[PDB]
Ligand binder design. Structure first.
Ligand code: CO
Length: 257
């Protein structure tokens, strides 16, 4: 029964999910002066040329663009990762106002939104087994700032009216996630968790330094979605972000000098 409201939001999650107060929780503030360049990081490889998107779903908390992960078709490798991680879905977190919405922050700066491309480690066979492992998942996080429109986002925006309410889905084939990436792949990395319940501590986070720009009109259309189901009182889908959590005994590494 978790969500993002006053009575069921992030400050309540620990009661059903005690790992919310764990040693490896996400998101975090990225203190750029404390993060250290790591020359042992290999080059990051984002191989999304054969990505096969299938469907888009409003799950009552965000919307997921789902991919066919039955074959190695869209994969993340390199950087801090060992082996191959397969893309299963992406989603966003965003605010009610342009001054908030991201989960990670950079020297306490909040962006308008944050894109998460979720991948699972193929050594574990499927996503469900991967989320029982400390290196099960790799999430590529990309900040969104408001400015010029992002052409590669428009197909997402324009289908949101068809998935307004919780539980609705639509066909969403032939979507190219390359068009959501910034120019540079410079990143920060650290060990963390899912940022929604069950908050499992299974993620290698790779957070790109360069944000993408999206237009005010694009993000306003995200804010017309609903957390509620059809025929229920409208609750706008906004502020579906968890705030930064304690870094504890962790180090954030940078890929760039
Ligand atoms: Co997320």
């Amino acid at each position: 029964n978790w969500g993002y409201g006053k009575h069921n939001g992030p400050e309540h999650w620990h009661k059903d999910f005690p790992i919310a107060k764990g040693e490896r929780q996400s998101p975090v503030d990225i203190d750029t002066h404390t993060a250290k360049y790591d020359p042992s990081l290999k080059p990051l490889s984002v191989s999304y040329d054969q990505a096969t998107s299938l469907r888009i779903l409003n799950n009552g908390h965000a919307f997921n663009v789902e991919f066919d992960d039955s074959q190695d078709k869209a994969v993340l490798k390199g950087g801090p990762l060992d082996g191959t991680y397969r893309l299963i879905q992406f989603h966003f977190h965003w605010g009610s106002l342009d001054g908030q919405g991201s989960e990670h922050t950079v020297d306490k700066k909040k962006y308008a939104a944050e894109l998460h491309l979720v991948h699972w480690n193929t050594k574990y066979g499927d996503f469900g087994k991967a989320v029982q492992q400390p290196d099960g998942l790799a999430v590529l996080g990309i900040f969104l700032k408001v400015g010029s429109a992002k052409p590669g986002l428009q197909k997402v925006v324009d289908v949101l009216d068809s998935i307004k309410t919780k539980g609705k889905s639509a066909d969403f084939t032939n979507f190219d996630p390359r068009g959501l990436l910034p120019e540079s792949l410079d990143y920060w990395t650290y060990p963390g968790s899912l940022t929604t319940p069950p908050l499992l501590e299974c993620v290698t986070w790779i957070v790109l330094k360069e944000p993408i720009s999206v237009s005010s009109e694009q993000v306003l259309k995200f804010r017309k979605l609903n957390f509620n189901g059809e025929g229920e009182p409208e609750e706008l889908m906004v502020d579906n972000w968890r705030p930064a959590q304690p870094l504890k005994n962790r180090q954030i590494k940078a890929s760039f000098k």
